[PDB]
Design a protein around this ligand. Structure first.
Ligand SMILES: [Mn+2]
Ligand SMILES: [Mn+2]
Ligand SMILES: [Mn+2]
Ligand SMILES: [Mn+2]
Ligand SMILES: [Mn+2]
Ligand SMILES: [Mn+2]
Ligand SMILES: [Mn+2]
Ligand SMILES: [Mn+2]
Ligand SMILES: [Mn+2]
Ligand SMILES: [Mn+2]
Ligand SMILES: [Mn+2]
Ligand SMILES: [Mn+2]
Lengths: 299, 299, 299, 299, 299, 299
């Protein structure tokens, strides 16, 4: 198996902080390195991408895009870092705060694939644009931006766009969308398994369908896992908790299936928030999930 | 869609209080009005039904029927209020404390239908009578009384009985019954999905069966939802918590299915107890469930 | 039905204590006696088996087998006590601390059956030997020892070995194994339903398969239930909690199914740890499960 | 186990013959006696119930009820014979032609049970009445009549009615119904697993659900198996073949499950028609199924 | 519902006859008209498209495209007839011999839809071209030709091409392909459920996936059912029987699901061959399937 | 891939002939050579092993072992032939009559492996001994003999015993056993999937479990396929047909799975009986199964 390179991006740049910047530190504390070493991986921790400060009481920036400069600049550096990791033939594993970092991760990865697919495991769709976002928070726009729909500053990160096509994205666990997002998912024809579908189909079927779909049409698959995809009972420490989510068992099963499938070529675990967490529980859950993603088997 | 009229009944009249009288206040605090307005409903909050005080230690009374007078009188007023709401062509949404208020809600509603059905979502069956009740608490007798079995002060509320037939009732989530209640359910032939059946069949099947059953034999359906039907992990703040209940996901799914089905013509969310709740969590869960019942869709 | 005899074994003899010695007391506090009496059983509480003190860091002993003498001696007594209970035609119900006591329980029971089967409900396999155990804790070796694999001091308890054959054991809820344990399960061909299988098959199917399997090849079945088989969210108070376990609902269903099946001829509920418990919750869960195992029905 | 008494009823009394009268003879030829003796049963063959000749043309009668007198008289005698068998503490095994004989079998059996359940394994519902039957054939009315619906001549056989309640009947394999039958099943609330449900659920689940349902509400269960419940590829020799039926494997499985369950207290295998059979194949299939029902195990 | 217009195309134009020209007559004999009338449809039988005689040897023939002129001319007329039926707002139901007629049916239908989907139920893929066909039989090329890959004579029928896009086609029951066909399916990315997938997934899942797939991307769906998709045990009378096919039960279920889905806007049942049939069995099977496709329900 | 060498053994040496001696000829007629050549294999047909005539009545022969000399001598030659094929680095494919030839095939193969596993696909167990056999037919003893149980004449073939260990055998499709055979399977602990297990688990799961089991404990696997493992509807022409068997689809799937698995190192298709076959159907089924076993894929 190829070596892994961890990159942490302690970003918490929404209009107001959510504590997710501490995510990387918490997951490191939970033992992500050690967990992966036990699985016999050659893994390195490149450290963290530097993040600019958020907008003070009065600074320059776009109303419709909170902390656009800092967000874009951080993502530009991440894109470079991720690109290099891939260049070196290593698997990039990005740990983060804001899901906004998916813009940077996909920017560095996508250029290396003809048809890169994406499994967006999240409670939210993240397909807002400056036009549709009620808040202007870029963390609610990473998927749209990566599809080539968003502010120029975000869609062009890495020097190109789009990074992926809508037919190569599969949303899982979604249970919170803005009307514009519903319209977007709908009009762009993005495959999506809302909690409703998981309830009616069961995670095993959802995963089999997802894996088969992407496998038959992509040459690499990126897993963008937002911990809030899980229910707050299992993952209390997240930036924006939403009730009615995926259980740890469903998520653990999903990771094992992806592992077996061997389709994931890059991944990122984001939005861990120590402020709402209980004794680093969520960070530990993230690490266990990474463990399964990377081959850990119960027998 | 027709307008909605909310009626609160802050009743906590068992032998000893359980804190459920604060349920309506908590659900209002959780934003029930606002939640429904966003769905574009013409909704009004009629306020609360006045409740008489509880009897003390050694007052004159019926020990087989704790606080019979106050309970009956409050239910009589509620029946009148509900009746008028239906008269006005509005949907009655009763919020409450004791599940005893079902007697009043059904009294006001039933007379307006030829074959009114009932979905009793609860951890308990509520089919005790003065003869079978170990406690004498009327909150453990609402369903039986509404079916016409029990003591007269309760069965005659609204000026008639019974309000419904056993063949039109479906119990869901039951996991706590007295021997007499098991005998009652059994002898009266009441359809029931205990936690065992939900476990073996899955909520989607349980709801499909329920919806079809009632649909093919009633002209209106009343939803009497006791928050303790959900597991205390999801709904800690209830009058009488019972372990091993329905998850919020199963309940959310159930409400969405009922909404799609369009069979619910009146509803009541009861037994919310702020004293055992965690930061109004259960009240918020009640409101989210109401949201789904009234059309809120995740996509 | 035959009478029940409860035997408590307050053992907490791993290298370092885990608080499980308080398990019997906690379960008695949760009302195990009363619960069973209500089901109309003739039940007695024989009390507790005396346990020798643990060894201190620099004392002569066996590093590969922590507290071997005290563990072996306590199990020898238990075996005798259990044997007598069976002799009297009573059902032995052992309550405990360390799962090591399974050696004693099986020693007293097995000799009374031609083909005794075992359902090992646990988060761990407990099939380590002095050779494979990283810790040397005997509580991680009870199943192997009972199968005749391990150090003579444990395998010979009761004056014989093995107590059971690998084809008559079914592991359920396993999610934590040492490599040697994986090899053992594998090479010995022990039937096992890891959390993965429960996720894919569902508890109803797992239990039907298990019950049918053992029923078609044994003349008695022993249930060795380790509370840590349940998820720490339901059973926080256990010696060695492991995330991703069985829910109380799945476990309650399992017990009801076993009861219906009438195959359990002896049982033991172990590893309850008051130190990590929340208001005797886990002890209460243990008692509710016992209640189901012994006939308690929700309707 | 109790002794078995075989009773043959060579009835072929629809408007026009279907050859099913030869059913008993064919099943005897297929070795039903020998098959059961090998299982170590004390079994006797009481012989055949005498059947009156059918109405031709210039005979006073009714079109709404073909051969009502002969059918009724034969069923009256069968009821008596069956009654006596039960009186003697023996298991009544009726072999037949027309499924109309279920009227007689149930008449003799039911009176000996408080809540007799029925598993109706058939391609048809058999719930027509003189009013709903397009043909007037009584073989299409046995279940309805036994439930107390139909000509008094049929509903009163044995001197009472109804023999069973709708809540204690489970139809399996149904794939051919008249509109009135659909209405009947629907309005009476008879549990039914059409070929659609078997396809979606699988026979193992169908049988587990059926067995549990009846077990939890009856004190005896009668199996009324019409060979046409099986697909004509497995059972070509039947009175009224209908494509899309149960396989021999599903039926064999069902019989094994019922045997395990120990719920069947009486049974009848009917509608075998030598005229459409291939080398007594269907008769042989009936006997193999009876073998499984009575304990024959493949290992 | 809209009216139906049946069109028969008695074509048997492969290099050597297969008897499928008699298909339309056999299906009419099996009662297709009467079957649909009972379902209350306004249906007409337009009769048959005239078919030119086949080349013998010493004529203007083509070993790469057997009977190209007659095949093309017949399909041109069929296209016109189908077009007119659609024009009239009627549902075109084409009955046939060679599956080559799908060229004509799709030519008349497709032009009326933006994104016409196709469910190709067959034992074969029918995606050969003059270049890849070992035989030169056009009946092995209808799907390819309709996708725009084939001789101009076939691809241009109706005055346009292609009639459909590969993303809108779903093959079901395939079990017989030429290497070139495997390459074609593969390279064009046509969704296909071979018998292998049906075996592993089950027909219910195959149909749910298929229906959802096409529904989310087409504005009309054409069903091209080749009776050889069914196993020769159920459908013996077909032009090119292939062992290991779909059962009548799976096919019947499929038709019911499509009916429920309401996605089929045109259909054709082809390749019925009276010469290999047993008492018009296959023709009767076709009619029962049409009955289900058009609303016939077993309850 | 390595070359294949076909060896035919036209043996029909039970007490009375069953026509299976013609099996090799029928499978050759069905095109086994041609089928494999198309898959691009270097394959040779070594011809047939000479078989001695059988005893009549007034001739030397053991009733407990019908035709022991001829059977043993034929198997001795076969063992030699198979041994040499393996020596040459070729895959031995034995075609046959009596399943007794498994003794010879395993004798020639096993010696070349440390832990040879066996998949015994059959309607019968073939584990009788001279002591347990009701008939004395050696064709009902090949598995037992190969396990080292039976007449020295059979157990010692090839100059050694046993050829395999019980832990390395998996029986599939069994549905016909003698009591002694049940005891043998049971006591020796041979893994077995009776038709019951296939019904409850489905062939995909049965095969996955089988493949994994053997793979994790053997260095070569021999497939001993008796055509009677399939249901007589699919494989009518077999020596001893037994109703209720595996479908062609399940068998075809099984072969495809084994092929994918790459675990089969030798194989034999036996018991084909032209006398009960319909137009060489069973022989053609055998060849299609061999085609799948050797790589034939439907897409
Ligand atoms: Mn996000
Ligand atoms: Mn999120
Ligand atoms: Mn209640
Ligand atoms: Mn309650
Ligand atoms: Mn343990
Ligand atoms: Mn444990
Ligand atoms: Mn019938
Ligand atoms: Mn019938
Ligand atoms: Mn075709
Ligand atoms: Mn075809
Ligand atoms: Mn054999
Ligand atoms: Mn055989």
């Amino acid at each position: 198996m190829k070596p892994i390179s961890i990159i942490g991006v302690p970003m918490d740049l929404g209009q107001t902080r959510r504590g997710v910047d501490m995510g990387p530190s918490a997951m490191r504390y939970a033992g992500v390195i050690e967990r992966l070493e036990r699985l016999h991986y050659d893994i390195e921790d490149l450290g963290d991408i530097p993040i600019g400060k958020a907008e003070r009481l009065h600074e320059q920036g776009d109303s419709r895009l909170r902390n656009l400069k800092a967000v874009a600049e951080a993502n530009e550096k991440l894109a470079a870092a991720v690109d290099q990791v891939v260049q070196r033939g290593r698997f990039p594993l990005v740990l983060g705060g804001d899901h906004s970092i998916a813009i940077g991760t996909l920017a560095g990865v996508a250029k290396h694939y003809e048809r890169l697919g994406v499994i967006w495991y999240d409670a939210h769709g993240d397909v807002n644009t400056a036009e549709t976002s009620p808040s202007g928070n870029i963390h609610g726009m990473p998927l749209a931006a990566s599809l080539g729909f968003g502010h120029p500053a975000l869609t062009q990160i890495g020097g190109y766009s789009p990074k992926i096509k809508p037919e190569h994205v599969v949303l899982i666990g979604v249970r919170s969308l803005d009307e514009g997002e519903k319209k977007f998912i709908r009009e762009k024809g993005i495959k999506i398994y809302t909690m409703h579908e998981v309830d009616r189909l069961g995670m095993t079927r959802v995963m089999e369908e997802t894996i088969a779909y992407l496998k038959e049409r992509t040459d690499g698959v990126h897993l963008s896992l937002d911990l809030d995809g899980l229910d707050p009972s299992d993952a209390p420490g997240v930036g924006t908790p939403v009730i009615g989510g995926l259980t740890y068992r469903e998520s653990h099963l999903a990771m094992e299936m992806l592992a077996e499938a061997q389709i994931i070529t890059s991944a990122e675990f984001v939005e861990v928030n120590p402020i709402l967490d209980e004794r680093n529980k969520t960070a530990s859950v993230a690490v266990a999930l990474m463990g399964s993603l990377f081959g850990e088997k119960l027998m």
